[PDB]
Design a protein around this ligand. Structure first.
Ligand code: CLA
Ligand code: CLA
Ligand code: CLA
Ligand code: CLA
Ligand code: CLA
Ligand code: CLA
Ligand code: CLA
Ligand code: CLA
Ligand code: BCR
Ligand code: BCR
Ligand code: SF4
Ligand code: SF4
Ligand code: SF4
Lengths: 61, 31, 80, 119, 154, 75, 27, 731, 38
């Protein structure tokens, strides 16, 4: 929801499913996948920074 | 013991059956 | 023909079209992303299916998926 | 061959007699004014389009798809526009509502003539 | 049948065969040759080698078999190097786990596994000695395991 | 690369010097089998030291260095 | 051990061959 | 329908040569055709089952006919130790002159039937060629019956309804009762009426089998339950199999153990055996409901087994749905159960040799075991291959909502990690110990070996009476509970067979048993690491979760995301077929080198020279291929010249497999373009143009055809070496 | 200064360490050869 929040994912096809990651971008411009999140570890394409929607976006405290 | 029968059946199934069966299957590709 | 389907992860960064050596994929103005772009695959009759798009598809997991369908003359890519 | 297969005729124009490389192999003379090139398959032709375009300005180029009944087609360019550049004329086909995450299981497509992504 | 090894006859036949067969090479050299001295030390390394197998069980082959039941009459065969070995790779496993859960939180963890922090590496290299009651005290703390890590579809 | 080759050839001339039976081989070449490398005596592998004559054993050369040295005239 | 039973055998498997082509040209 | 794949229009439009190969390899893939729905599927596999059964009975009528007509069967009956069992005769026009002198056995030039068939037909009670002809006609008739049914149930109004196919409920009421229970009961009706009297000398052919009862008094004072009369007078000691000397007249005596003379099981034991198995299966046929309604609803049998412990998901609720609707689950259980049955068959054909004068010809016994082990491994790999086909093209995790199967796909990570652990452990602790023993033996010292006595197998042989170890437990101790408990019934006839070292039952055991049996468990756990891997990661992995969308044998995903060579669920097949041939490799090398030490006699030749690897490559491959590879010389040839040829032939199969396995397509796809350029451009051949366009083999086919040459080369090489090795050291 | 950082890399530490444990086994098998007990 907010920038910089540590966020676990709930979409089973991501490489980072059930792994927390830091929110880079939150866009408020009707984008279906507005929240650009990057990570510590890296998938097979060499690309940690991906993006997600709000339903697949669980913050922690 | 009809000993002459392999001298008939072993060629007519060993070679000429995979000639005409090549014809039947391979024309049967186009039928 | 190799059915190329382009899902809604397609943030329109055009490495698919610039990566495809067949112009089966173009870019379509689609007001659903930040860049306003989303690729399309109209001419999948020319689609080889070499999956050079899915190499250079920097989405989360593969907005553009190339399903290996039928094999015509052009989709087999034979020279003669 | 030209009696039964589609020959792809890349036509283009230039300014100087440079030297490019054929997809057949080996260098070609590169007529300066305007020149055609009959090719075999499309990846050769657009590989020549990348062969020229990543070197220098070669634009106003496109293959006429010679199919053996006689007529032509217009590949590459299609719309006076470069394909990764966005023109507001290309109507999108080949999309679904979401990611792979909502594709149906193939035990629901089983014994039916559908696809695992159609929804 | 597992005979006690010090009185198996074919075992002693292997003693005669390797001492005498190795002594066939000793019939080439003079009394002060360094080769000949090496075969003196080698014959020592055969008689000691066979007298130090006096409590094994060489069967019908004259070859010393083992036992892995933990009979406590044969614990020096297997279970004592079993406990010893599991201590050594519980050391190595605990050192590797402790070092990775160090460098998981550093500045550049990718650089930390190429270039080992020999400060913190040789910290943990030695510090993983009491790993049974360090893993048993981290396991009661809810820290040895993990939960809700990566998984595929289903 | 030439540094590794000179380390290698200096290795061959030193293994010919210290470890080999080359001076003994030069007496009767057709009887004494050529050997340089004298295996260290650990468990069992002292059996690799072949009694190749020359009053000293070790694993046998097949690289033919001694035939290059007799042609060279190394005495 | 005889010859006539061999003829009877290839008759019965010739008929069985007609059931093989008979089943074969329906599935 | 238009061209070739009269069944798939996705391949009839293909102009290449792929329409041929995929037209062949997807022919039996009935779940993926043009418009073949469920009723049109079961009504085709049900007919093709009949075509298959008629192929089986045509084949067994083939063996009956060649043994009936070209074999030496009754001359073999005269002297079953001396004369070799002849197979079908030869007609080569290629055997010039010197070959024919290396095959004449009488007037015939026939092959020597190394398939154990005369033994089984000799214990059945076939003592003539006439009964073989009447049996061969009796199976040509039966194959005509099965072809009649498969042709008959594809005739349209006799194509049965799918609700009949979904009477899953009652097939088990009829297979367990009729197919298994009655027929085995009927097989006692053979053994009581044929094998017992024609073993005890009485030629009970098809005449007097209703006028000569197998017991001299029978069935009018025998509904009264005086059943000890049928086990009254056994065949004790002084009998040769076939005559009437030294034999009693009891039918169902359970002595246990072997013959003294033929070293096979008693046919009284098999008559009583199939009779008891018959009664227990007929009892098991009364298990499920039907139109009557006295039995078990299967939904009430998988629904009820949800534990209140709660650990095992929401129980099996969902399993009965995914066996009716599925087929690859049902075929996976079928190949699993048949495969474990085959391995049980193999582990008992040598151990308890059933057939008289087997374990006397040492080649047929060496071929039956290896035969059923390679068929055993093939059918396990079929069970897991259709397991992965079940998890892709047949699995519904919404009818399997948090089911036992969905629980399996949940903890598949722990499953594959622990299979990989035990396979790694055994692979560093067989190969570690063989390279230890081989270095140490190599360094002039066989004594400094690690030999671990396999005490658990020695203790289990002590539980079955093998007194040669000194444990003195349940049956080895003659005073225990089980030792007294069957002291009259079957023990003293059986412990003689156990404590003997002639027979192949409960063998004497060195540490080669230890190191090899760990190598076998390495093979099982690697092969299930692969199969359970690409059966549980068959559906979706973290490399690509799209895998369920692509079907079973999709090729790859391209170079994207690092490279994706062999990600499919077909790879687990493709690799665990190598591990199948390897593992069954070590099983049959171990068995065959154990029995080339027993049959030669020098068991110490095994136990001293099998604990390390040059014991195998020296004492078994280098030495026992000597009468093989002398199959033909520049001095002449002998009868082994077939196998020594086949041997070499099979190497040429095997390494051609590597041409497809190692070197993949895009080499050849740009080499066929040179061949088609050269064919198009040349004169006198540009007239003869192809119709199907020449295209190199696709990379599922290519890995498959390289696998097929790997199997055919492997199995023909080892079938050459078993038979030429034992037939060279003997016969 | 940075030489020790080269001596802290993966293969150099792996050879200075596996050289050391290999030295433990080789020196512990000259001194105590043929150790099948314990
Ligand atoms: C950090 C050290 C470490 C630790 C604690 C473990 C622990 C484990 N591994 Mg392992 N592994 C490691 C390193 C480690 N691994 C490395 C470096 C590799 C690459 C070779 C592997 C490859 C590997 C495979 C392929 C498998 C395991 C498995 C397992 C589990 C079963 C135990 C086993 O058989 O080990 C396996 C041990 C080995 C394969 C060899 C030992 C690994 C190295 C050489 C020893 C550790 C030294 C390490 C480099 C020290 C670094 C720290 C130091 C510099 C300060 C266990 C949780 C298995 C599993 O999933 O079971 C549940 C399994 O199948 N591991
Ligand atoms: C499982 C059922 C089963 C099977 C597979 C067989 C199989 C066989 N029986 Mg048979 N048999 C059975 C049940 C069975 N029987 C029963 C229940 C009876 C009692 C009526 C008999 C009584 C019987 C007789 C009397 C003879 C056979 C014979 C034979 C053999 C040749 C049959 C032929 O030519 O056609 C064949 C191996 C014949 C045989 O073995 O030749 C000596 C023969 O003469 N059978
Ligand atoms: C009593 C009635 C009866 C009987 C005898 C059968 C018999 C058969 N049915 Mg069937 N069926 C029945 C009722 C019956 N059915 C009913 C009522 C239904 C409807 C609910 C069906 C529905 C049905 C379907 C849908 C299918 C069959 C099929 C089959 C065939 C199985 C394949 C086969 O031959 O395996 C033979 C197997 C054995 C003999 C035993 C194998 C395993 C044992 C344990 C090992 C062998 C024993 C021994 C150790 C080895 C001896 C070998 C020797 C060399 C020593 C078989 C002929 C299938 C088929 O192939 O179609 C024809 C098929 O698809 N049936
Ligand atoms: C399904 C197999 C089968 C079949 C068809 C028959 C059929 C027959 N048996 Mg029979 N029988 C069988 C199994 C079978 N038996 C078995 C397993 C045993 C051992 C318990 C016997 C023991 C037996 C005796 C002891 C007698 C028969 C007899 C008979 C005949 C008259 C009843 C009849 C032909 C009677 C007869 O005249 O024998 C031919 C007779 O006295 N049977
Ligand atoms: C009764 C048992 C049984 C049955 C009914 C099936 C049925 C099926 N299997 Mg199958 N399978 C089985 C056992 C069985 N399998 C076993 C035991 C294994 C392990 C070896 C497999 C491994 C297997 C794989 C890997 C695949 C199947 C597939 C299939 C499906 C399509 C098969 C097809 O179209 O082939 C068409 C027919 C052929 C290809 C002919 C077979 C020729 C083979 C390849 C080589 C034999 C050539 C021979 C050795 C050369 C002779 C020369 C001589 C010198 C030896 C079908 C439902 C496929 C599937 O469902 O995926 C979509 C698939 O990919 N099966
Ligand atoms: C000689 C042939 C060979 C060998 C040894 C192996 C060995 C192995 N395969 Mg395998 N495989 C082979 C051929 C072979 N394969 C072929 C032909 C195929 C078909 C392509 C496969 C397909 C296959 C699959 C599909 C799988 C395996 C797996 C495995 C591993 C099983 C677990 C185990 O036993 O670990 C014990 C480890 C060993 C036996 C390794 C050998 C020990 C080495 C030599 C010592 C370490 C190096 C040593 C110090 C030398 C240093 C070198 C020097 C330069 C410094 C094991 C490494 C599986 C796996 O990953 O399991 C976890 C797996 O899933 N294999
Ligand atoms: C790095 C591993 C290592 C370790 C821990 C040791 C440890 C030891 N060495 Mg040693 N040594 C090593 C490598 C090693 N060495 C190498 C690589 C060589 C070859 C140059 C030697 C050559 C060597 C000799 C020649 C001697 C030792 C001796 C000793 C012991 C002295 C106390 C001690 C146990 C001495 C000893 O106790 O032997 C009697 C001794 O005389 N070592
Ligand atoms: C992985 C399987 C395996 C296992 C379990 C063993 C086990 C053994 N090997 Mg061995 N070996 C193996 C593989 C294996 N080997 C292979 C693959 C090879 C070929 C390279 C060899 C080659 C080999 C040789 C040449 C010799 C052995 C010997 C031995 C024995 C003593 C080891 C030793 O040096 O103790 C001494 C080591 C120690 C005392 C060190 C432990 C001290 C710890 C680290 C200190 C810290 C404690 C806290 C031991 C039974 C020796 C023997 O006598 O055979 C019986 C021997 O001479 N092995
Ligand atoms: C993938 C898949 C699958 C698979 C397949 C298979 C292959 C399986 C496995 C399985 C198997 C392969 C089987 C096995 C089993 C096991 C067993 C069965 C064991 C046990 C044992 C026992 C039981 C024994 C014991 C004993 C004795 C020794 C004597 C006394 C008594 C008794 C009996 C107890 C399935 C279809 C399922 C599902 C789907 C998918
Ligand atoms: C006694 C004996 C024996 C054995 C057996 C047994 C005992 C078995 C079982 C088995 C078992 C009983 C197992 C268990 C397991 C389980 C689990 C559950 C595991 C765990 C693991 C873990 C937890 C790991 C971790 C770790 C650690 C701990 C340390 C560090 C490293 C690591 C991290 C890796 C024998 C016969 C040999 C011999 C005689 C005696
Ligand atoms: S999908 Fe990946 S590649 Fe295709 S446009 Fe969007 S970003 Fe560029
Ligand atoms: S499929 Fe092959 S060709 Fe068509 S776009 Fe994706 S990569 Fe380029
Ligand atoms: S090689 Fe061909 S098949 Fe194997 S991964 Fe690269 S692309 Fe996919």
């Amino acid at each position: 929801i907010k920038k910089g929040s540590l966020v676990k994912i709930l979409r089973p096809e991501s490489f980072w499913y059930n792994e927390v990651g830091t929110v880079v971008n939150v866009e408020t411009s009707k984008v279906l996948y507005p929240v650009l999140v990057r990570f510590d570890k890296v998938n097979y394409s060499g690309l940690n920074s991906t993006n997600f929607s709000l339903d697949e976006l669980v913050e922690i405290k | 013991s009809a000993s002459y029968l392999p001298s008939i059946l072993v060629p007519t199934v060993g070679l000429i059956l995979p000639f005409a069966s090549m014809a039947i299957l391979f024309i049967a590709i186009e039928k | 023909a190799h059915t190329v389907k382009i899902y809604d992860n397609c943030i329109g960064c055009t490495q698919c079209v610039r990566a495809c050596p067949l112009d089966v994929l173009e870019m379509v103005p689609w007001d659903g992303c930040k860049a306003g772009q989303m690729a399309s695959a109209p001419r999948t009759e020319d689609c080889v299916g070499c999956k050079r798009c899915e190499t250079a598809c920097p989405t989360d997991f593969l907005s553009i998926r190339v399903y290996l369908g039928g094999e015509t003359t052009r989709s087999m890519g034979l020279a003669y | 061959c030209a009696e039964t297969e589609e020959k792809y005729a890349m036509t283009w124009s230039s300014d100087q007699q440079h030297i490019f490389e054929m997809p057949t192999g080996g260098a070609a003379v590169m007529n300066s004014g305007d020149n055609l090139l009959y090719l075999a398959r499309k990846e050769q032709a657009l590989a020549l389009a990348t062969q020229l375009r990543t070197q220098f300005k070669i634009q106003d180029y496109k293959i006429y798809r010679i199919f053996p009944s006689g007529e032509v087609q217009y590949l590459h360019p299609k719309d006076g526009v470069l394909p990764y550049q966005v023109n507001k004329g290309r109507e999108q086909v080949g999309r679904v509502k979401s990611t792979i995450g909502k594709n149906v299981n193939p035990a629901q497509v089983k014994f039916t003539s559908k696809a695992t992504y159609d929804r | 049948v597992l005979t006690p090894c010090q009185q198996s006859e074919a075992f002693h036949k292997r003693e005669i065969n390797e001492v005498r067969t190795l002594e066939n090479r000793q019939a080439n050299y003079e009394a002060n040759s360094p080769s000949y001295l090496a075969l003196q030390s080698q014959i020592d390394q055969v008689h000691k080698r066979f007298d130090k197998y006096g409590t094994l069980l060489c069967g019908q082959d004259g070859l010393p078999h083992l036992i892995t039941d933990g009979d406590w009459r044969h614990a020096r065969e297997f279970t004592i190097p079993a406990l010893l070995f599991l201590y050594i790779t519980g050391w190595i496993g605990w050192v590797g786990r402790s070092y990775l859960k160090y460098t998981k939180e550093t500045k550049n963890p990718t650089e930390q596994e190429i270039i080992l922090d020999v400060p913190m590496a040789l910290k943990y290299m030695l510090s993983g000695f009491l790993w049974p009651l360090s893993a048993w005290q981290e396991y009661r703390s809810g820290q040895l395991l993990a939960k809700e890590d990566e998984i595929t579809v289903s | 690369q030439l540094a590794i080759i000179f380390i290698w050839l200096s290795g061959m001339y030193f293994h010919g010097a210290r470890f080999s039976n080359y001076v003994a081989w030069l007496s009767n070449p057709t009887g004494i089998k050529p050997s340089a490398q004298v295996v260290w005596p650990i468990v069992g592998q002292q059996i690799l030291n072949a009694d190749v004559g020359g009053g000293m054993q070790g694993i046998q050369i097949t690289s033919g260095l001694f035939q290059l040295w007799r042609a060279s005239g190394i005495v | 051990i005889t010859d006539n039973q061999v003829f009877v055998a290839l008759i019965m498997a010739l008929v069985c061959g007609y059931l093989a082509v008979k089943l074969a040209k329906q599935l | 329908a238009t061209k070739f794949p009269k069944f798939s229009q996705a391949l009839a439009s293909d102009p290449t040569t792929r329409r041929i190969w995929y037209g062949i390899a997807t022919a039996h893939d009935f779940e993926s055709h043009d418009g073949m729905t469920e009723e049109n599927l079961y009504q085709k596999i049900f007919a093709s089952h009949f075509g298959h059964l008629a192929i089986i009975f045509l084949w067994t009528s083939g063996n009956l006919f060649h043994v009936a007509w070209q074999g030496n069967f009754e001359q073999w009956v005269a002297n079953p130790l001396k004369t070799k069992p002849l197979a079908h005769a030869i007609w080569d026009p290629h055997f010039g002159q010197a070959a024919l002198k290396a095959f004449t056995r009488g007037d015939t030039v026939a092959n020597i039937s190394y398939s154990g068939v005369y033994h089984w037909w000799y214990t059945i009670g076939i003592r003539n060629n006439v009964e073989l002809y009447t049996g061969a006609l009796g199976l040509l008739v039966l194959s005509a019956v099965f072809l009649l049914a498969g042709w008959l149930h594809i005739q349209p109004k006799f194509k049965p309804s799918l609700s009949w196919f979904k009477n899953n409920e009652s097939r088990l009421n009829h297979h367990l009762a009729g197919l298994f229970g009655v027929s085995s009961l009927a097989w006692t009706g053979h053994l009581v009426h044929v094998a017992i009297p024609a073993s005890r000398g009485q030629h009970v052919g098809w005449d007097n089998f209703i006028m000569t009862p197998p017991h001299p008094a029978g069935l009018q004072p025998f509904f009264t339950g005086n059943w000890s009369v049928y086990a009254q007078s056994p065949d004790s000691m002084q009998h040769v199999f076939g005559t009437s000397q030294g034999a009693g007249t009891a039918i169902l005596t359970f002595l246990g153990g072997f013959h003294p003379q033929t070293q096979s099981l008693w046919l009284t034991d098999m008559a009583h055996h199939h009779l008891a198995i018959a009664v227990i299966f007929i009892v098991a046929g009364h298990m499920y409901r039907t139109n009557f309604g006295i039995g078990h609803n299967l939904k009430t049998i998988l629904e009820a087994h949800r534990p209140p412990s709660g650990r095992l998901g929401k129980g099996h609720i969902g399993i009965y749905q995914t066996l009716t609707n599925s087929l690859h689950f049902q075929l996976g259980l079928a190949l699993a159960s048949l495969s474990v049955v085959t391995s049980l068959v193999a582990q008992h054909m040598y151990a308890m040799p059933p057939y008289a004068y087997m374990a006397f010809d040492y080649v047929t016994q060496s071929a039956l075991y290896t035969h059923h082990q390679y068929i055993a491994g093939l059918l396990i790999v079929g069970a897991f291959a259709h397991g992965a086909i079940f998890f892709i093209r047949d699995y519904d995790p919404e009818q399997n909502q948090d089911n036992v199967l969905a629980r399996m796909l949940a903890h598949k990570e722990a499953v594959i990690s622990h299979l990989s652990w035990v396979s790694l452990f055994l692979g560093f602790h067989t190969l570690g110990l063989y390279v230890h023993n081989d270095v140490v033996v190599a360094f002039g010292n066989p004594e400094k070996q690690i030999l671990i006595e396999p005490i658990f197998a020695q203790w289990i042989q002590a539980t079955s009476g093998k007194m040669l170890y000194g444990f003195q437990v349940l049956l080895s101790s003659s005073t225990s509970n089980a030792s007294v408990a069957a002291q009259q019934l079957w023990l003293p006839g059986w412990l003689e067979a156990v404590n003997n070292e002639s027979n192949s039952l409960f063998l004497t055991i060195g540490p080669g048993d230890f190191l090899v049996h760990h190598a076998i468990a390495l093979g099982l756990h690697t092969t299930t690491l692969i199969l359970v891997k690409g059966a549980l990661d068959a559906r979706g992995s973290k490399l690509m979760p799209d895998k369920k969308d692509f079907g079973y044998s999709f090729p790859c995903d391209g170079p994207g995301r690092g490279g994706t060579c062999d990600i499919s669920a077909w790879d687990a097949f493709y690799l665990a077929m190598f591990w199948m041939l390897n593992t069954i490799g070590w099983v049959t090398f171990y068995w065959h080198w154990k029995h080339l030490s027993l049959w030669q006699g020098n068991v110490a030749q095994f136990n001293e020279s099998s604990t390390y690897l040059m014991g195998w490559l020296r004492d078994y491959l280098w030495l026992n291929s000597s009468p093989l590879i002398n199959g033909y010389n520049p001095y002449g040839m002998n009868s082994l010249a077939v196998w020594s040829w086949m041997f070499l032939f099979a190497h040429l199969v095997w390494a051609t497999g590597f041409m497809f396995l190692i070197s993949w397509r895009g080499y050849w796809q740009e080499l066929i373009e040179t061949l088609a350029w050269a064919h198009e451009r040349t004169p006198l051949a540009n007239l003869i143009r192809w119709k199907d366009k020449p295209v190199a083999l696709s990379i599922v086919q290519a890995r498959l055809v390289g696998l097929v040459h790997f199997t055919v080369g492997y199995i023909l090489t080892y079938a050459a070496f078993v038979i030429a090795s034992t037939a060279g050291k003997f016969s | 200064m940075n030489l020790k950082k080269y001596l802290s890399t993966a293969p150099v530490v792996a050879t200075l360490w596996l050289f050391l444990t290999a030295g433990i086994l080789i020196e512990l098998n000259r001194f105590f050869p043929d150790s099948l007990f314990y």
